[PDB]
Structure formats: C-alpha cells, structure tokens
A and B are shown apart, each in its own frame.
Chain A
Amino acid sequence: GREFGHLTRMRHVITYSLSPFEQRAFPHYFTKGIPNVLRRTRACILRVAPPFVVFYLVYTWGTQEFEKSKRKNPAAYEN
C-alpha cells in the first residue's frame, strides 16, 4: 500500500545532497547551536513555564499549610 514509489505526486522540486564523508558531522555545533537553542527556549518558555510556576506556588502553599495545621494552637489550652 504505502511504498516509496507511489506515495505522492511532486513536480519540479530539485534537491542537492552531499556525501556524509565529504561533510562534517558537527558543523558550527556551538557557534550556531547555542543561539538556536536560546531562540527555541525563548519561543517556548512563555507558553510552557507559567503552569509549572503555578504548580510550584501551589506545592509550597500546600506544604506550608499542612505544616501549620500540625502546629499547636495556643487558644485551645487558654483555660
């Protein structure tokens, strides 16, 4: 059914490729790689981060509140 020969019809798309042995495996890995990673992180962070910040706030609040709940109340023994 799905085989390379008959997958789709494409016309007038020329692709130029180079042999692996003629090209470097890691080209500009850091000079270009780190800026691209920073760009992707800049794009993603606004969407991704806020919910985990909300989670951190909820987690801290819950832990502190449970700790407070266990703590003694002076008023109970006032009499």
Chain B
Amino acid sequence: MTNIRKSHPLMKIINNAFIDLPAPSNISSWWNFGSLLGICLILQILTGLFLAMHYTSDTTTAFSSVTHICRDVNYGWVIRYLHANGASMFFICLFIHVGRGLYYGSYMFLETWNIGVVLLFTVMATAFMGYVLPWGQMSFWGATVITNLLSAIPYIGTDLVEWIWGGFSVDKATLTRFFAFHFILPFIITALAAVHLLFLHETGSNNPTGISSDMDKIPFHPYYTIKDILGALFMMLILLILVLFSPDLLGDPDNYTPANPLNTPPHIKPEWYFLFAYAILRSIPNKLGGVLALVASILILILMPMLHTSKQRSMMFRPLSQCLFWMLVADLITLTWIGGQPVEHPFIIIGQLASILYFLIILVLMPITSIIENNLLKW
C-alpha cells in the first residue's frame, strides 16, 4: 500500500507544498507575512466577487451602486470596508515582506525575487484600477493625474494614454475597462504567486541567520500551519479593527462625493500605498524624469541581488547595514508623509533629499558599507 497523501498526484503536490515541506525551524514572525499575503489575496477575491454582484461599471450607476451596497445590500458595508481596508493590509504585508527579503538576503533567490517584483507591480495596478471604480472625486482625478503621466513617454505617450483612456479623457470607457482589468488581474496574481512558491520550494526558505538550515529543517504541517493560523488571526484582528471601528481611517473623505470632471478636489493625492512613488515623482521637475524615477523605485529591487557585496547573506550579523536599512525605512515613511503633504517650501526640499537618499542608500551606501564590513571581519 501507499499513503494517499504521498501517492495521489494532487495530494502529492499539496503535501510537498504545505504538509511535509522541509521548513527552517528558526524562521521568525516576519516569515508569516507572506502567508498573510496569500490570505489577503483570497479574502480580496471573495469580498470583491460578492461586491461585483452588486456593482455596475457605468458612470451613471457606479457611485449609486456603491451606495446601494453600503446602505441596502445585506451586510454590504462589511464586504465593502473589508475590501477597502484589506487592500491597505495587503500593501502593508507586501512592504513588510519586501523589507524582510531585503534585510535577510532573500533576494538571493533570484527567480522568486523577480517573480515577486512582477507580483508587486500587478498588485499596484490592481489597487489603482480598483480605486477608480467607486468613481468618487478622488477616483476620477487621481486616475486623470496618474494616467496623464504616461503621456510623458516620448512620441507614444499621447497615443498610449488615449488608448488606455478609451478616449480623450477619463470617462465611462475608462471605468468599464478598469472594472474588467480589476476583475481579471488578481487571478493572474494568483498564478504568479503559484510560480513564486514553486521557485521558492526549489531552493527552500531562508532563515533569519542567513545560514543554510538543512540540518535544522522541521515539518511545516505540525508547526508552521498553526503559526500561520495565529498570524492570520492577528492580521484579522487588525483588519476588523479597521473595518468595525475606523472604516474610513485610511481613506480620503473626498471619494464620498460623486466625481465632477469640471471641478477638481482641493487636494489630489493617491492612496497611501502609492504615496512614496508620488513623492519621488513630484521630486523630479521634469515629467519624463519623474515617470522614470517612479519606475526605477520599484525596479531598483531587481538590481538588489547584483548590488549585494557582503560575504554574509543576512543583515543580522552586519550592524552598519542594519543602520542603513532602518535609515531606508525611515526614508520611505518620510516619502509617504511628503507625498501626502502639499507641494510647498518645507515639503519640496524634504522630498527631493529623501528621494536622493533612497536611491543613494540602495545603490551606493549599502554596498560600500558591506565592503567595509567585509574588510573589518578580515574576510
């Protein structure tokens, strides 16, 4: 005989992936965010499927549709705010996982890291398209601002922007296209996540120490399944705190006014997850330079494996790199704060210096510091 778990094909795949997968025994709670990310993706898919049963993509009926969900669909407010704040939880976990990979040298898993970069881009696109769907003033004007950035691309910017718009400006066509894309993209994200896990399982999972843990591998089923359930429960606590006590904490009030294309909102600012890229974009005076810098901010992650110069994979045993990494985190927080703030004398200079510091820390300071640490260790 044979155990069905180990011999049946689908059960074989499932067992290898999450029941008998050799997992490092010293993985910390920063290794719970990724499974939290998958839970967030599933939760977003379900909540959105239930929302879309009541949402209409025509400009005449979109805002009324969202109001219908909030005030008339049974438990509709729960689903709507679960989706809205789940997007924020999604991006929080995404940033935390990017930080974990940066700090512990998980980017050395080149294929997994690059697939993750692709996933990050796809999720950002999904969030931006979703924000336009409610069709509030913020949705319309933020879409107008962000899409207009593509016009900067030389000799094809205008045609590409008009093709995306479906017309001369953001309008019913753009809303319908964004509803379709917002629906389809998450499943592409799920497939990319499957590829991500495949590539990760090829090489295993890096531990906090940065040293190979083949000696101390523990089964995932009797240990990390319960650890991830606990982490998911904590994340659910936070998300439900948002949904049931501060449903509008992370959202701008202006999106509760129907979009008026003839009057701009007093402040046109993107969602909080996009704010650092917005600050970087505003930092560069030239439009094309701003667009290229915004692209490079996310794409600099691709260059992270090459920039590695330390003889040690993880930053746990490298203090100066730890100081630089925490400087980078503070800089990202500063960029978000600046992107939220109006463009004025105090904020403009701070944003420019912060963008310079972000790129400098990633490209120059970190590798030179790693080399200095290598010399100090006599390596």
Contacts and interface: CB of A to CB of B under 8 A. Distances in A.
A65 B346 contact: yes
Interface stretch (B37-45, B284-292, B320-328): B320-328
B83 to A, nearest CB: 31
A52 to B, nearest CB: 6
B326 A8 contact: no
Given A7-B22, A47-B319, A55-B334, A66 B347 contact: yes
A59 B201 contact: no
Contacts of A2: 22, 201-202, 204
A10 B217 contact: no
B193 to A, nearest CB: 20
- Interface residue SS majority, chain A: helix
Interface residues of A, number: 23
Interface string B309-340: 00000000001001100110110011001000
B18 to A, nearest CB: 14
Interface string B252-265: 00000000000000
Nearest to A51: B330
Interface residues of B, number: 27
Interface in B78-134: none
B322 A47 contact: yes
Nearest to A62: B346
B228 interface: no
A69 B329 contact: no
A51 B326 contact: yes
Given A47-B322, A59-B337, A66 B204 contact: no
A44 to B, nearest CB: 9
A30 interface: no
Contacts of B345: 65-66, 69
A3 B22 contact: yes
Contacts of B344: 66, 69
B249 interface: no
Interface of B: 20, 22, 201-202, 204, 212, 214-215, 217, 219, 319, 322-323, 326-327, 329-330, 333-334, 337, 341-342, 344-347, 350
Interface of A: 1-4, 7-8, 10, 13, 47-48, 50-52, 54-55, 58-59, 61-63, 65-66, 69
